[PDB]
Amino acid sequence: TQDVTSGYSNLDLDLRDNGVCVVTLNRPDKRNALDVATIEELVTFFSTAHRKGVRAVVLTGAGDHFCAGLDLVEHWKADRSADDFMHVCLRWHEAFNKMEYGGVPIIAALRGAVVGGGLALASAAHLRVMDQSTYFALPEGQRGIFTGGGATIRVSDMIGKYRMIDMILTGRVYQGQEAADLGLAQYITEGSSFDKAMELADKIASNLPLTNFAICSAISHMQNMSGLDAAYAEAFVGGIVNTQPAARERLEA
Amino acid sequence: TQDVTSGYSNLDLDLRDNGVCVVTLNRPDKRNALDVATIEELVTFFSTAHRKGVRAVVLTGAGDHFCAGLDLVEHWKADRSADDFMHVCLRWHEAFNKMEYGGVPIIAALRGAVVGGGLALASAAHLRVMDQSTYFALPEGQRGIFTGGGATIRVSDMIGKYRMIDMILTGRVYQGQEAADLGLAQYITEGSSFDKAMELADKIASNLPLTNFAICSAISHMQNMSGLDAAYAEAFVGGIVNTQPAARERLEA
Amino acid sequence: TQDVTSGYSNLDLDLRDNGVCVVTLNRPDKRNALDVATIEELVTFFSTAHRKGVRAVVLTGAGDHFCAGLDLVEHWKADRSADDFMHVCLRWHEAFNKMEYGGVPIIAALRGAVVGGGLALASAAHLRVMDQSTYFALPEGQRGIFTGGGATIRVSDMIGKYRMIDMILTGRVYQGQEAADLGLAQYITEGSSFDKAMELADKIASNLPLTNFAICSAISHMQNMSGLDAAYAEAFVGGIVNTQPAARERLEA
Amino acid sequence: TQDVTSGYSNLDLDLRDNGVCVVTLNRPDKRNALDVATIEELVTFFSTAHRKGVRAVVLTGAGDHFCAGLDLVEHWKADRSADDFMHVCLRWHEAFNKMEYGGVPIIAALRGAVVGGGLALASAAHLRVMDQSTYFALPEGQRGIFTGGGATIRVSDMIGKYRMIDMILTGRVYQGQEAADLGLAQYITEGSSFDKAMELADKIASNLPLTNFAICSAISHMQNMSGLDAAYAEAFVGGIVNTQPAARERLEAFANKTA
Amino acid sequence: TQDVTSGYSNLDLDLRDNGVCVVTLNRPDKRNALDVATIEELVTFFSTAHRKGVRAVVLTGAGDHFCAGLDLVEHWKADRSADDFMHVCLRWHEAFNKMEYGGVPIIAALRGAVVGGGLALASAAHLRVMDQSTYFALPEGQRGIFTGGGATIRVSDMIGKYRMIDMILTGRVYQGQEAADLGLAQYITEGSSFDKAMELADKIASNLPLTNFAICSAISHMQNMSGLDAAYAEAFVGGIVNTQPAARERLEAFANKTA
Amino acid sequence: TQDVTSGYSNLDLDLRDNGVCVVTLNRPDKRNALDVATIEELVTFFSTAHRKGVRAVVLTGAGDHFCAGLDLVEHWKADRSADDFMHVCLRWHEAFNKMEYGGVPIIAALRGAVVGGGLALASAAHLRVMDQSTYFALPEGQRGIFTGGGATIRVSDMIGKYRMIDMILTGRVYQGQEAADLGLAQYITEGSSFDKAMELADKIASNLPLTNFAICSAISHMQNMSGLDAAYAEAFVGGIVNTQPAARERLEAFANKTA
Ligand SMILES: CSCCC(=O)SCCNC(=O)CCNC(=O)[C@H](O)C(C)(C)COP(=O)(O)OP(=O)(O)OC[C@H]1O[C@@H](n2cnc3c(N)ncnc32)[C@H](O)[C@@H]1OP(=O)(O)O
Ligand SMILES: CSCCC(=O)SCCNC(=O)CCNC(=O)[C@H](O)C(C)(C)COP(=O)(O)OP(=O)(O)OC[C@H]1O[C@@H](n2cnc3c(N)ncnc32)[C@H](O)[C@@H]1OP(=O)(O)O
Ligand SMILES: CSCCC(=O)SCCNC(=O)CCNC(=O)[C@H](O)C(C)(C)COP(=O)(O)OP(=O)(O)OC[C@H]1O[C@@H](n2cnc3c(N)ncnc32)[C@H](O)[C@@H]1OP(=O)(O)O
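YS: structure for the whole thing
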């Protein structure tokens, strides 16, 4: 429906009949580099997806490469001051925080380069599916750049603080089974990562809206707390989710 | 001694001469599903084990399956309100928090199904030993249920926040070497997981009570703090543990 | 230069022309066991390395073994009170916290035994390179000792809280590819770990001082915060690092 | 300007030439109770105020009472499920978190009742100015319910965890100088709270945008961290704010004696 | 009832018909010093009070002094090792954490000395009522020792980290209105603190059990989190408490004008 | 002694026979503005004071004003890059964190201006004694800049997050009894703040070294944790401090009646 798919210049959207929305980064000529305009579009989409009824998102990059990172051309031309760039980083965080804590399951279908800000974007999804062409790296460090978008936060949760520091400090590249085993992606396929992502998304979309909402917002929040306080919060999350009428019906079913 | 082993209807206890207590979930006809009464028995046992002198616990399920999770039959019949269930979840947390932070080493000897609330229980032990029949999953999500018992907290520490979200979101199953390598169990055996657990427990029971106490309570607490404040707490833990007379004797020995 | 290399009795220093400083634990006759005097030397070196211009550190042990841990001979002879030892532990933390958050990249070239306090020291480096002779363990637990130096904090980040508890509780030893895959070291070599560490250090030293500084201090700090507050801090770190003139020059370059 | 004050209904907006925007809850016949429509307007306004160039906000309620809290009528009628209401609460948090961490100085000009969700709203502003008619309460318990809008977090920061528990647990009312001294408001006036709020806002709007942004976002974030980690973050905030070109003229003013 | 008040020795218990239970430390000849036996009784009582249906607790000390703290005699005599005493402290925490996070409203009716561990005990209650004879101190330093029972945590929440450090570092004594204003007690009376505590408790007991449970457990937990994460948890607490069937009658009372 | 008071320039040090060391900022003609050289001396002194045996510190400023904050002249002239200044701020934190968590009791004897970084410095001490000439402010905004030295952390702990935001956001000045009551200083005197500080310090120095160390380091660390985790840490702190041999004589003093 146009109410979900229109309004974006750098994203191509395709809403399926079961509520799965394919969100395709659409600047293939620039390897889907993320400029401020695209980030704002991500903020808008992920701020409203839940309320608009989107049941799950399959996030992919148009072309052979998922995302080449922050748009360094725009950055270089903009000749940003430290405060201008700090502000740009907060917009990246607003988009990625809405993805991580927004409650709509996001499954990234990766191909080719998932680098720098592109790895930050991939990390903001709940699930990642990589194929035989996919590789991960934070190569900007070699050119004096500190990766943003919360990669230092999310990639540390994915592969461990020390492997994350190794990646940004050395520009080390991971791919194939090695990358999956490291924790960069939960799924690796010999075929189409898009098709595998759709299979996962369709199954997820068939689950209860509230249950998926809790799974895709409460767990990240609880990981930010002491486990002794998270326990208490979890009891309230379980109280609401597990006593919903639709849930009771499924148990009976 | 009856002072340690009597008083439980759903648990079968066997106290060995070296202080190792075998705690066996004993509802094999229901695949050791955890109902409120069993949870209360776990709260009682783990609230008092340290003060009663138990040196280590080998936790296992009677039968071919460790634990089938929360008792969904009791749940369905009870037709719980959100607040009734929130309260039931707090009891699960009281039992599992007493296990994790209580200071008595717990070694789970797993077999067959370790699912849903059963994985939450297994996660509350310090060590897990799995065998060739053991498998892990959080299958309730497919039926609209959010897993409780702190699995979102402990399993995230075990396998990573994103693999934990993947498990609850998709119902994904892990077993064999793959599960051990993922972080679901530190030990995998080709033989008896109970026998391997006993070997581990006997060695642990031969160590100093206070040292084991600190290992099995302080580390979980320190992980809940900033590493800069945990450092300070660790200095005091080390100060008390490492200057005990029994410790000095062992160095000399 | 003497301004960087002189002043240490238990450490041997070698400053290379590109700012890489080799810091060699130098008590090979005692397997580089760490006594209070050596710890104080580590506090001094790592408190001043950044301001003295050191660009990266290659940390190694003289001889066939990296570090045998806390000096148990000094400990036993000192017959320390709980408060005396608590104070000794705070000095270990001061040294290791200066290593972890000080902003100077530290690459440990490991060989042989990396045990007890020696594993705590290795863990305080950002990167670890192990060879075919390297092994890791926390064997003091068997003799009633709780490992200090923040190993419970850092090793948990490296291999997971539960694998860390397993190591201290059982004295379990890891080595070879198994240890690297577990997360004990990011690099494993069939040749010289010192040579591989130097290769890494030389590449790191060729990067921008400020970028390396942020990578080697900000990430550890952000991991101590809720991801929602770390996001904000990261924006300011990115703002300062990514708008430095030297960075702009490298983009143009 | 039309791009800042247009499109709203429950809120009345007035952008002054110096960048101060007066945001008035405009449902006086309902004592400005916050229903879902009004919360969504607050989410919209505070999500974009900074980027739209608003320099400061004076938040007030039309009529004799600032805000009576959650619209209990809409709530009772909707007969909400626990998940329906949890979702409503998250919208409140989206609005109030944007107010607290958004970087735009907000000064609440209070009058009369500042109760329940109304106190949650007042607490989400950086500064509060109360007058002699202002009174504070968390009467939720009386209705048999729990507060929301982050009142348990913000009011505890304002008056202390134990005084916040006392307020919701007993329904205790605070007003006058006692309320100001307790920490419910930094300013209390014998006259118009609105005029005092405008005075504060005009002075704030005359300061540097970046500096106000940091003050109105960084401090709340640093309070959520261990002080040892917050110190490191503070250094980066100061590094960016304290070396901005716009501050050098003022630093020079001190160098001599013009300042 | 016998299933609530039986089996104790160091504590005297009186369960009133409205569910208010009066818990009295009963060792007046020792100024109610807390020895290990008394702490275990507090652990037992507060671990089960909620499930036993206690609606509110009025905690008080027999005699002229609320509680003189750790039983120094038992302590000195036991000549405890550092690990022995660390274990004793953990039992204190088990009792006091159950009081703070247990969900049962606790109102302390203070008189005379509320010192050392005695202040730790008073701090573990949600509300404190002091009279004109009440005084507060953390004289541990004088004995050459550190406080316990979570006083460094709770008293800092009550009066501020720096005032808490001042108290233990100098042995400074607070009393009267000054103590109340400092944050040591929310209520101060010219008469009987016990009667004022009972008034508070009876009103609290007339509110909804679930609502009081949330107020007396959720707020302390949310203070331990970043405010951004606490907000999410608050939404779930409100979702459950605010949609409970028992609250609808009261919401209706407001819908009209009976309320 | 020469091994404690030698080698400094910007600081004047006087070690008294009872172990109390008077640390005086000695740049009165500059109102004791903290430049990089002075911060490095504070880092050096507080990094070693505990191991050197200093029992307590009385921190004061030469002249009529405690400390005017960051040396704005050096700052303006250096025309620092954001990273240069971030690094300067980290040095400030190294000094102030060593003061707060170092374990050596610090008592600030204030006079006149305690502003900007000067308040950050005063806030890093455990106790503050103000006189009738003392006034507090965070006038950074006026200079178009942000505070530093952890003022956003420590002052928020002292007077409340919202009063701290008010101070930097409006430049509001506090003084007299009002400042003391707000939480800016635990002690206010009609006479000499220095003499009152010395009285406090001498009494503190007469207590046990280990006990003071814990009080002056453990409490700040425990405030950075969830209260449930802090309780466990407190038990270990108490285990070590409360069983120290040196405290038994004092415990015995109570056993009888000599105490
Ligand atoms: C995210 S969790 C949040 C938890 C909470 O905040 S619960 C609410 C707490 N907050 C409270 O419990 C505050 C409840 N309200 C009051 O105590 C009083 O209304 C006031 C003290 C605020 C003002 O008194 P007054 O001047 O006498 O006005 P009133 O009581 O006669 O009410 C006038 C109208 O305002 C209406 N009104 C008034 N308050 C609301 C409302 N709150 N929702 C809906 N309609 C309302 C009232 O119904 C009337 O509507 P009408 O009959 O159509 O003319
Ligand atoms: C988890 S860490 C906790 C750290 C702390 O709390 S340390 C203790 C702090 N707390 C303190 O340091 C408080 C110390 N006590 C006092 O200052 C006073 O006793 C009071 C101000 C509380 C009351 O004064 P008063 O009415 O004159 O009573 P008293 O001082 O004559 O004492 C009467 C009896 O109570 C006894 N008594 C009194 N206090 C204790 C006790 N505290 N342990 C044991 N027996 C005690 C006292 O010994 C006497 O016993 P008796 O000789 O057999 O008749
Ligand atoms: C880590 S981020 C920290 C952020 C901040 O702290 S920013 C600063 C906040 N802090 C402030 O904004 C405080 C600014 N200072 C004042 O408001 C006043 O100087 C006082 C109220 C503190 C004292 O007033 P007064 O007795 O009239 O002294 P004065 O204003 O005549 O100044 C006398 C000398 O002290 C010098 N002086 C005075 N303050 C400084 C300084 N602050 N840096 C350098 N030189 C200074 C002043 O320049 C003069 O130098 P001179 O012309 O060579 O004789």
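YS: worth flagging: Chain C has two domains: 1-207, 208-253.
IM: good catch. Also Chain C touches chain B through 48 residues (CB under 8 Å).
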